[model samples]
Target chain A: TSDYIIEQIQRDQEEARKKVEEAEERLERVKEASKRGVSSDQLLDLIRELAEIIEELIRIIRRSNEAIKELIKNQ
Target chain B: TSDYIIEQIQRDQEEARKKVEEAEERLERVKEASKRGVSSDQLLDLIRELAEIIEELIRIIRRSNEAIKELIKNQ
Candidate 1:
């Protein structure tokens, strides 16, 4: 019962960790491309993409704790 | 009292419908891009991202109906 809840947290945490890494990579790519004087449109687009990825990563990270809370409630 | 409660559900339902539409649009974009030769990795990422949005829409949809059901009991 509680096992499933804890397992979901572990799974979400793993995915969140990977998403964070992807976000960092995208941020670096944007920075390097901007340094070379990329088009303003392209730069803005990259920033938007990076923000979206980070936002999702944060969402999943919150879910991990929510799973824990639900697990406790069932106990 | 009851009026405001029903109003809240109406607002939530509208917002959830819009969210569902946006998710569907994103899913379509991902599918089109893949059809045009985007890497499988990119396609997989899009699919995974859509999962979260769909999950949220489902939650709101469930809550909206649940609110109505709960109201009936109080009546």
Candidate 2:
């Protein structure tokens, strides 16, 4: 059944949602925090961390899609 | 009406889904093609493009959320 896969996908998306929410918080605050003496480098560093997370998320999605594609193709 | 925003968000998600699907195809094909003398660099290039798309998507989401947040805050 696809139930497990669906649950896993939902869980993964939930995880991604939380990560993005945190990133959003950082993004919103960092702009204002900069007025309070936050370094530009700190913002860039957080953005880099976000970039890495996004890249990893893409890998997860591509990997799963490949698996599903293979399954469909071979069936 | 919130209907407009919901529709816009659905459209944006559909757009993102299409982009991800294209990325998935590229990822799968590039991996397979690499074994046949296609350079890994091409794969990485495609991946970088995908990464940029993802970052833009995140930015779009973030901006819209900020707009909504402001709306809620001031209302």
Candidate 3:
């Protein structure tokens, strides 16, 4: 997970490398923004946004895993 | 595990505390309103309720992290 900087999928692919660099640039901006005078109300809004995004990503990942499992079973 | 527990959890605890405090404040206000002649329709505030629930779960998870972390790491 990029949360801790372990890029498992990208490995050393050039395109993936470039994407990671871009993502890092965006993440740097996000990190820098965190240190500003962000109010609790904004923090709650961010938490809510993050919660929704996390739920959606998890739904997609679980569906992907199920699809892969079905493919393996069919094969 | 410390990364999972120590800092991130304490941060979450603080957020949850703020959220709970806010909710309790609102709850008290609503109770006082009911004491007059009005009451809140929580049906329309589902998102707010869900956020409250999420923070409550967050607080419970934070409180249980010492036990939970062992299970988390065992796998």
- TM-scores for all candidates: the values are 0.45, 0.39, 0.32
| Cα deviation of A40, candidate 2, in Å | 35
- Residue-wise C-alpha lDDT for candidate 2, range B1-75, written one tens digit per residue: 155654564465456557666655754554354345433344334334534555655654444343333323321
Candidate 1 regions with alpha-carbon error over 4 angstroms: A1-75
What digit string (tens of lDDT, one per residue) describes model 1 on residues B1-75? 255765675566566556656765775565455456444345445444644554464354345435434443442
Question: Which candidate number would show the highest lDDT if scored against the true structure?
Answer: 1
lDDT of 2 at A73: 30
Candidate 3 or 1, higher lDDT: 1
Kept native contacts, as fractions per model, are: 0.00, 0.03, 0.00
lDDT (Cα, tens digit) per residue for candidate 3, span B1-75: 334644554464465446555655655443343332221233223324434544454334334333233323333
Q: lDDT of each structure?
A: 0.50, 0.47, 0.38
What lDDT score goes with residue A9 in model 3? Answer: 19
* Per-prediction tally of clashes: 0, 0, 0
Per-residue lDDT tens digits for candidate 1, residues A4-50, read: 64456556655655655565566556546544444444544543464
Q: Report lDDT (Cα) of residue B1, candidate 2.
A: 19
Q: Which ten residues in a row have the lowest lDDT in candidate 1 chain A?
A: A66-75
Better of 2 and 3 by DockQ: 2
Query: What are the per-residue Cα lDDT tens digits for candidate 2 across A23-72?
Result: 55654554354334444445334345434555555554444343333323
Q: Which candidate leads the pack in TM-score?
A: 1
Collision pairs in model 1: none
- A16-58 per-residue lDDT for model 3 (tens digits): 2343344345434433544454644443443344345334322
